[PDB]
Design an enzyme around this catalytic site. Sequence first.
Site, PDB file in Angstrom:
ATOM      1  N   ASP A   1      65.258  99.106  -3.110  1.00 57.72           N
ATOM      2  CA  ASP A   1      64.066  99.532  -2.676  1.00 57.72           C
ATOM      3  C   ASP A   1      63.423  98.774  -2.013  1.00 57.72           C
ATOM      4  O   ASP A   1      63.991  97.567  -2.211  1.00 57.72           O
ATOM      5  CB  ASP A   1      63.130 100.404  -3.394  1.00 57.72           C
ATOM      6  CG  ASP A   1      62.702  99.353  -4.614  1.00 57.72           C
ATOM      7  OD1 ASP A   1      63.594  98.781  -5.190  1.00 57.72           O
ATOM      8  OD2 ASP A   1      61.515  99.885  -5.344  1.00 57.72           O
TER       9      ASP A   1
ATOM     10  N   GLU B   1      62.371  98.634  -7.569  1.00 59.33           N
ATOM     11  CA  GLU B   1      61.767  97.622  -8.538  1.00 59.33           C
ATOM     12  C   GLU B   1      60.539  97.218  -7.969  1.00 59.33           C
ATOM     13  O   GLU B   1      59.328  96.728  -8.561  1.00 59.33           O
ATOM     14  CB  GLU B   1      62.438  96.558  -7.835  1.00 59.33           C
ATOM     15  CG  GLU B   1      62.404  94.686  -8.873  1.00 59.33           C
ATOM     16  CD  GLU B   1      60.951  94.657  -7.871  1.00 59.33           C
ATOM     17  OE1 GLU B   1      61.162  94.633  -6.567  1.00 59.33           O
ATOM     18  OE2 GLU B   1      61.175  93.136  -8.081  1.00 59.33           O
TER      19      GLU B   1
HETATM   20 ZN   LIG Z   1      62.908  91.803  -4.250  1.00 64.49          ZN
END
Ligand SMILES: [Zn+2]
Lengths: 212, 212, 421
Positions: free
Chosen positions: C84, C154
Amino acid sequence: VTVFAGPSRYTPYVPRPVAALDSPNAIVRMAKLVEALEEWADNYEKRYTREYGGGTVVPKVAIGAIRGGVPYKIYAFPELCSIYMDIRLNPDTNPLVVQREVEAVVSKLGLKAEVKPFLFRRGYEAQGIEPLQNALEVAHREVVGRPTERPGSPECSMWRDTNPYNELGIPSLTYGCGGGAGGGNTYFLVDDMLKAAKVYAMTAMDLCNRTP
Amino acid sequence: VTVFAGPSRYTPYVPRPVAALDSPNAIVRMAKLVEALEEWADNYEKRYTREYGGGTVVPKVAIGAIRGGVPYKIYAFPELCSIYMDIRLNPDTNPLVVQREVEAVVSKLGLKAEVKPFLFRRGYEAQGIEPLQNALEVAHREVVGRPTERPGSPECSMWRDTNPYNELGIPSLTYGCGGGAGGGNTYFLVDDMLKAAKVYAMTAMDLCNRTP
Amino acid sequence: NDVAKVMKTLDGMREGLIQTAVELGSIEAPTGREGAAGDYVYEWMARNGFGPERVGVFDDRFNVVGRLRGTGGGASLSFNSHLDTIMAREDTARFADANDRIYHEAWHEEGRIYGYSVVNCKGPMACWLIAAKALKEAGAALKGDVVLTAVCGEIDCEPVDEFQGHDYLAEDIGARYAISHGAISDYALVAEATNFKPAWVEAGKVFLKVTVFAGPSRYTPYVPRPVAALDSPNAIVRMAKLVEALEEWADNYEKRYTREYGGGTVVPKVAIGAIRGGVPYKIYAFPELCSIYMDIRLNPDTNPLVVQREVEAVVSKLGLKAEVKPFLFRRGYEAQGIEPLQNALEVAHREVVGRPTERPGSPECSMWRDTNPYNELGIPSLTYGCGGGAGGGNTYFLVDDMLKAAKVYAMTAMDLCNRTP
Ligand SMILES: [Zn+2]
Ligand SMILES: N[C@@]1(O)CC=C([N+](=O)[O-])C=C1C(=O)O
Ligand SMILES: N[C@@]1(O)CC=C([N+](=O)[O-])C=C1C(=O)O
């Protein structure tokens, strides 16, 4: 074939040690039954091997699938486990005899199990095949250039749609180029395909011009 | 744990007799592996038993599911077969240690297999449980009328949501009225339940008046 | 020996490194829509024979886990980066410069690869994908497995209030989910842009929703004036005073909870990331409540509750009535037993880069990294990679650095994965 056991326990409660045939886990019991049925299968094909004019049938057995429990819920072992057996029959064997034999294997191990047929089809030796056999033999000798040999046992110990034709009073044989896929072969020679086509054509010109 | 075998053959072509461990049928090989793994499981819970202040952990192993082939196509035995193992861990055992032991079992049988972890969660002993343990013990002694007894091993060797609380730094213990449905209990005395509700309320009246 | 062969192989893979990073980096993959990025990585791992699996909570937001299988008896090492990226083309609530090319595109020019999505985090990801490829294709001898873990979600997005489920989730469906569902190894290196400085401590966090109460609301033609701010019936006006008090607290909070570990120095910071009171389409009566949303980093040794109580005390000192509600809590960890990975990395680094590793700055030790889930799960993990930090924030990678990083990764694996676990 479904072996029963249980009672199921959450893994942190499972009783050990327990002898295989006594395991509350049906999977563990079934593992021992599989070994017994493999032994039965080894001898089964010998015992029911049978020679016919149309080929020598060697009826074989295999365990085609197994399942017990489900992989997305495995924290409690299953109380039952099933295998699915493919048992070929020569044309003169009643399916119930075979079912009894398998039930006998189960009881000799002292296991409780349901032995349930979910498919039964008959095999046939053709009757009155001679006119086709002959038309074929003539065309074959002419095109391929040698008398036909008897087929290998697997090729007349399987399912082919000669069964439905013979069942319905239409004398039928199987014949064509190449090794059997089940064997299994991977390719055809175009040359062989041509021969087969010619054999087919010649067989028809003979047989279809004989009187019914 | 997925055992490999093969090559698959149409039933009429299956080779027999073949020694189980050498069977082209992955199901037959897997039946042998199940035996060895059961033996391993019997010792595993011995070798990894471990005493903690909060309980004695007896980590057990069970085979919760098996599958090979599919029931609706059984005419050619499968080249692979899979079982799914639930292996409990004491809080101090790395899952890779266990995976490597299972892999060793496989190797010792001379089998080719994939041992694939598809779940890993850590277990915990609570740290700094004393204030909750004491507030509970006091309420319990009053209501139930005796000192708390240490819990059976299964109740200390399973999954409970104390694990995520403890993981996240919130000291946590499990406690309530009843036999373990694990186990196999199936009823609650309303009186016991009312005792539990009292223990809970007292535990709170104490603990929630402790200053942080 | 094997090392020399692999270095050579990597020398000859610069074009694959460039192409992988640019292709990956070009895929729009804001947290919430990482699916396409995951698909690319799955197909890349499949082409290169790493036997990838999609491991995910949702079928269009998943982690991708592949493997280079070792010959047996060695420590296994994970490489990890996230799929992401930061900027959604819609994020004009946050950034005045929304949809500048740098935030949404990636391209190679003059031995540089530009793009925020390259810096964070497709670039470092490409580095270890290439490293794994080189290891495999050179036939490097490895006793232990190399685990290849590309994770979704993340970035520190979180559901809250009416923003729930699929579109708003991140870390709960990312790395920890991947590890918990099979992506385990003895050690783990998280590839992020750290300018070749290794860190093995990171912060935790608690997010607080602070809602000040006031009222009673009045139709504007009836509003009482003048009233002291802290007494204002308008919660927005009260919140304005609270914001200043909280900024003062935040200023000292980071000093008071600064903490030096072996793995780096944690300086845990505080920011007010959002505010809302009333709704814009109905403003004729001021609101009786107003909420801010606070991002509060935690050093590994701070209980979230201590922080909650401190914020409650700021509120109380002002004499305000507020609800201080945690809506997120994750722990930070200092890696334990990190030495074998730290050492293999140090050796590889000194060889490839030429000097000992420098110590990381506080910010890179005081944020969220996926080393936390690894360390949490007993997998000693540090963060290391090329490029100036994205939160720096850098806007390109030198292709030369990327190659160094790939070589460092490959050497690290050839060292560690041939040690006995
Ligand atoms: Zn990162
Ligand atoms: N921890 C469990 O909830 C999970 C699974 C079972 N069970 O196997 O029925 C029982 C539990 C229990 O002790 O409550
Ligand atoms: N009768 C079949 O068509 C069906 C099944 C297979 N097979 O499982 O390979 C082979 C046959 C054959 O080649 O005759």
